[PDB]
Write a protein that binds this ligand. Structure first.
Ligand SMILES: [K+]
Ligand SMILES: [K+]
Ligand SMILES: [K+]
Ligand SMILES: [K+]
Ligand SMILES: [K+]
Ligand SMILES: [K+]
Ligand SMILES: [K+]
Ligand SMILES: [K+]
Lengths: 292, 292, 292, 292
């Protein structure tokens, strides 16, 4: 499933920074009960940067085992070297994931033609649906609508997570792709706007702690009930902003701990513990959302 | 060693995309003959992003072997996970490198406290000198002067490669650190200005192809002869700009090939071959510098 | 009238840079026949910068006389000194204009509180409806949604022309103002998106040469027929971009000459004649729109 | 005359918002005693935006009268319409000013060809020396080095106030102009760096309140004594930053009042009185500089 509220799920850790199976179970149960459409496993919010390929595959496989067929799982699979992306994708072929979320190469700043060759090569070598991921503020490069148009002609490139926050991208892309290509926001604060312009859903950080409200917001949006959706969005807006008051996923992991969804808020370096001022901002946002 | 013209050396490849030992030897001999001060091996221009850690280590070790003590070698050792950076650095402990060039984590956008903890942990697990490297256009992170001050207190953090192109940073950093902390430019087009303000050298892309001119420019600067240095700078300014007409190191590899310094201009995806227009542009820049 | 397609009309000039009454008549007749909602007289596109207060008032009065009750006229009235804005507004009180379009002070970069006092003072001293105008790329300051919310409580501050091109502003403002407050795009390339998010119309440059299509696009948008509107917008998109290929209103005046709507494309310094390359780009855009 | 520390002098006002002659005399005497090189009258810091042209001229003429030949006076003379700039400049022909400071047109965002034609027309209608002034954060326009080169060929265009804060511009401009073209900083916080790179002085906000320190800093720079100059710079760096904690000249007027240099800190809307927090911040900066 590639529409609606999709959670960019945390990778909960114990105090030593190893994956906490019990906490992950609790989250997956929460998303199944709360109507989340799908789970993105080991994306950005899942600390893809700091897990190696083996830990990464283990978390995706644990997620699939715990989901037990009840919710679809999408794996984070991007890399900044095309061979590495291909490699990582092969590990998931026939795993039971429904698709991959693959970020533009970071740090090396490829050209548009380089992005086109990168994602074309990845798609060629799997039968899994690929969702492109554009987030220039993190990567240093910006996959432009013209190149998305080119890539959308590849049979298994099926959509994009557009995290620029630049809402003009929705209809720039839409006009260049077919009606079945999925447009997903990657920017929780602008996501409702993104859906109102023609987007199909959101791959969300806020959904980690407000799963039911996110799922209902996205359904109302899909039905065209934007005024109703916006009431929900206004209650969630402080979270949409304050989950980034310190680097993601520092705030959202602390929030999940505060709600009791995970045992510890531990992260791996270079992520560091939430500051006291951040705890206060985040808990105020949680209370605005009605969650505490 | 950590002053003057330091080349950010290309990792020359064969047509298959693997290191070309004959080409590497030819470059290293060229830098020895030309008066280059040091070699940074497998930094950004060396394709750090697309070599695996074994491949990376092999290139460093080969470079050291071929240098044969004639020219000091600094290894690129950054990572966006602190554990990974510590592992990569440990590969080189007792190798013969003189220090490490370690980039701010990319993609995961840590806080300044995160950057402090990351670089301090790395510095604690080695005796090698550490050069911090700040290049926010690539990483999504900006290591601010205040934080560089805090880190400069760690015994083996000894300098910074400042690749913002923002020349105010020179004296902002200089006032927070001791007189022996080295300030190196990471932006060829502003590097002579950077030295004019107090910087000690440059880790240079241009020096791949204008090694003697860059070493002479930097000597003239260190001696206070800025007008004479500027004449050299003006001859090189089109290369300083046009070696980034397509993503680095696409242009500089082509230029190396055109000058007969390497056998092929092959790179790894997502870097792609230079365009025809790019070739013309770089060729004009080489003609301007008097190299072709 | 403060909804639909509102034209930011050129001030047509003869070869000496004086207002050409015959050309202005022709434009006004064109807008009446083409279903334009209202005319903004001596706004940015009308060369407010280069007319003095007397020429400015004369053009607004000539526009009103030529309109002859058939189309509403809004006057550009902004200034960067609050006393000057008040002064200029008084000249129009009881002129027959329906409202004023008042830009944030330019060059002096006032605070939000300064913007609040500026526009509050202007509104206090007239009974005319005021439409606020935010265009940071020109002024150096950005009237933020919180301040718009404060100002919208003033009885005669009735709407905003939002020219940031940042579409998140639509619902940030909407949630802070009453349902009768008018939200108007000032960015033709994003205007349809702006209306789809809840905006009420556009104060448009493109409407100078595509009045009928703009009027129909905005009506379809108001009715919620966004797919139908978007077909029109895609035919107009090259104009929406290429009317800014050189500084506005250089392209649109040349376009109006090419269509025969005005006798000359003359402007006042520091605007200079369209380049040959600009003529070619603009005429290609006109042909894409079906206008030539 | 056009080197060293040039003060961008405040236009001190009474409580009604009109020029305070006693205050103006007190400032001018202060600059004479302090070793300030020249006075820019009714530039940006002098509230050019909120004085009418008669008021502006009166302030210039009063300043000249009070200077009584003891200190040279440069008039602010910019406008965003070329005709208006020519008129304002003509008011001062034979006045006794030594030159004019003329800003790039603001708001109307002319092209580089437009900027060339605007400044060349102005220079053609006077015998007075013209200092170009580039401050894109205020104007929406950036006068690039190439264009400054073209303009430097006009006999009476003799320098530039470069207020981008982008220090690469120093040597970019210097290489395109003759040795007698004057380069002045318009950014106090980077001005010592700007002089280190080859600039000839600063048109300074800080010099309103630290005139002797700024003149001594600039003398030390001209002589090549940068380390000694930097000590002065470090003492002043909090003022250089915090005189813009609220929009200029809000902080610097308050500071002048607090030091007893002017009778009131009144400004004209849309500038508003300093906030309490701003007062505390500026006061701390004055204490750091040793002035309070
Ligand atoms: K990693
Ligand atoms: K497809
Ligand atoms: K990699
Ligand atoms: K140290
Ligand atoms: K004007
Ligand atoms: K109102
Ligand atoms: K004014
Ligand atoms: K000249």
């Amino acid at each position: 499933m590639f529409t609606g509220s999709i959670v960019a799920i945390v990778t909960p850790m114990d105090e030593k920074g190893n994956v906490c199976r019990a906490s992950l179970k609790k989250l997956i149960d929460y998303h199944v009960a709360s109507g989340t459409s799908a789970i993105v496993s080991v994306g950005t919010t899942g600390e893809f940067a700091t897990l190696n390929h083996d830990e990464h595959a283990d978390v995706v496989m644990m997620t699939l085992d715990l989901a037990d067929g009840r919710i679809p799982v999408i794996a984070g699979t991007g890399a900044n070297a095309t061979a590495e992306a291909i490699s990582l994708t092969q590990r998931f072929n026939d795993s039971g994931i429904v698709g991959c979320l693959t970020v533009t190469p970071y740090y090396n700043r490829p050209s548009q033609e380089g992005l086109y060759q990168h994602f074309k090569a990845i798609a060629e070598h799997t039968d899994l649906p690929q969702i492109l991921y554009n987030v220039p503020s993190r990567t240093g490069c910006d996959l432009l609508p013209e190149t998305v148009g080119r890539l959308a002609k590849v049979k298994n490139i099926i959509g994009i997570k557009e995290a620029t926050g630049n809402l003009t991208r929705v209809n720039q892309i839409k006009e260049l792709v077919s009606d079945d290509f999925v447009l997903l926001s990657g920017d929780d604060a602008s996501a409702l706007d993104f859906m109102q312009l023609g987007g199909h859903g959101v791959i969300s950080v806020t959904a980690n702690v407000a799963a039911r409200d996110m799922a209902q917001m996205c359904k109302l949006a899909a039905e065209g009930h934007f005024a109703e959706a916006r009431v929900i969005n206004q209650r969630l807006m402080p979270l949409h902003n304050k989950l980034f008051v310190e680097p993601n996923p520092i705030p959202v992991k602390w929030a999940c701990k505060e709600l009791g969804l995970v045992a510890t808020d531990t992260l791996r370096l270079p992520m560091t513990p939430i500051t006291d001022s951040g705890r206060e901002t985040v808990r105020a946002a949680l209370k605005h959302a009605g969650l505490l």
